[PDB]
Amino acid sequence: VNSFSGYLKLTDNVYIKNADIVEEAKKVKPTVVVNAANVYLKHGGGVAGALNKATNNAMQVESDDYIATNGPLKVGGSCVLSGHNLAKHCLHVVGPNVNKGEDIQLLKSAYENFNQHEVLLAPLLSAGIFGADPIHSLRVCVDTVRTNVYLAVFDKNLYDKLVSSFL
Ligand SMILES: O=C(O)CC[C@H]1CCCN(c2ncnc3[nH]ccc23)C1
């Protein structure tokens, strides 16, 4: 038993809700919140900009030190950093950005990072400003993640289309 509430169950291990991931993180304090990161951990907009704003820019300060030490992530890769006031940990995961021409096949590699964590609150990778089809992203998630994932979908209209079209 865990503290996630109001989710629709899609499969044995994947759940979904119309929610603002920032507000969900603020209430649940999950062990892991996933950020929709880029390779530079520049949290300017989308999910990343919203998560970072909610930390009063502490996420960005920590991220800049991480990059200065380690260099950029790989597309499809991830790193574990602090969850600040939102979660114990933040798993920064880089899905391919279609608006940069990155290979959508890397989306599966991106979701594989979730399997290193027993339970996660997450957005749909490569959705939103990353330019991928969220229905495809959900399919890859279901077919790749084996750990327990709670997906927060900000847009109510999108949430209804994902549910109604789910196979
Ligand atoms: O319609 C969706 O979910 C997909 C849109 C992407 C794009 C970036 C922001 N998107 C979010 N997803 C969940 N929570 C959020 N809070 C603030 C933004 C946010 C995900």
The number of angstroms, rounded, from the C-alpha of 47 to the middle of its chain's C-alpha atoms is 8
Nearest-angstrom CA–CA distance, 109 and 31: 22
Nearest-angstrom CA–CA distance, 163 and 17: 10
Nearest-angstrom CA–CA distance, 60 and 78: 16
Q: Count Cα neighbours of 20 within 13 Å in the Cβ-side half-sphere.
A: 9
> 94 and 110 in contact (C-beta within 8 Å)?
yes
Ligand 1 pocket test, candidate residues 154, 157, 160, 165, most atoms within 8 A of CB? 154
Nearest-angstrom CA–CA distance, 82 and 90: 5
- Give the residue whose CA is nearest to atom 19 of ligand 1: 47
135 lines ligand 1 (CB under 6 A): no
- Give the residue whose CA is nearest to atom 4 of ligand 1: 128
> 90 and 32 in contact (C-beta within 8 Å)?
yes
- Give the residue whose CA is nearest to atom 7 of ligand 1: 128
CATH number of this structure's domain 8-165: 3.40.220.10
Resolution value in angstroms: 1.0
- Domain range summary for the chain, segments of one domain joined by +: 8-165
Which residue in 2, 1, 12 sits closest to 121, CA to CA? 2
State the angle between helix axes of 58-70 and 46-54 in degrees (0 to 180), rounded to the nearest 10: 120
Q: Which residues pair with residue 36 across a beta bridge?
A: 93
Amino acid at 39: V
Q: Which residues pair with residue 122 across a beta bridge?
A: 151
> 152 and 19 in contact (C-beta within 8 Å)?
yes
User: 89-93 and 78-82 as β-strands: parallel, antiparallel, unpaired?
Assistant: antiparallel
Nearest-angstrom CA–CA distance, 42 and 79: 14
Nearest-angstrom CA–CA distance, 36 and 94: 6
Which residues does 165 contact at the CB level (< 8 Å), separation at least 6?
135
- Give the residue whose CA is nearest to atom 10 of ligand 1: 47
Which residues does 21 contact at the CB level (< 8 Å), separation at least 6?
33, 47, 50, 51, 121, 122, 123, 152, 154
Ligand 1 center to 116 CA (angstroms): 23
> What is the H or E stretch that residue 121 is in?
strand 119-122
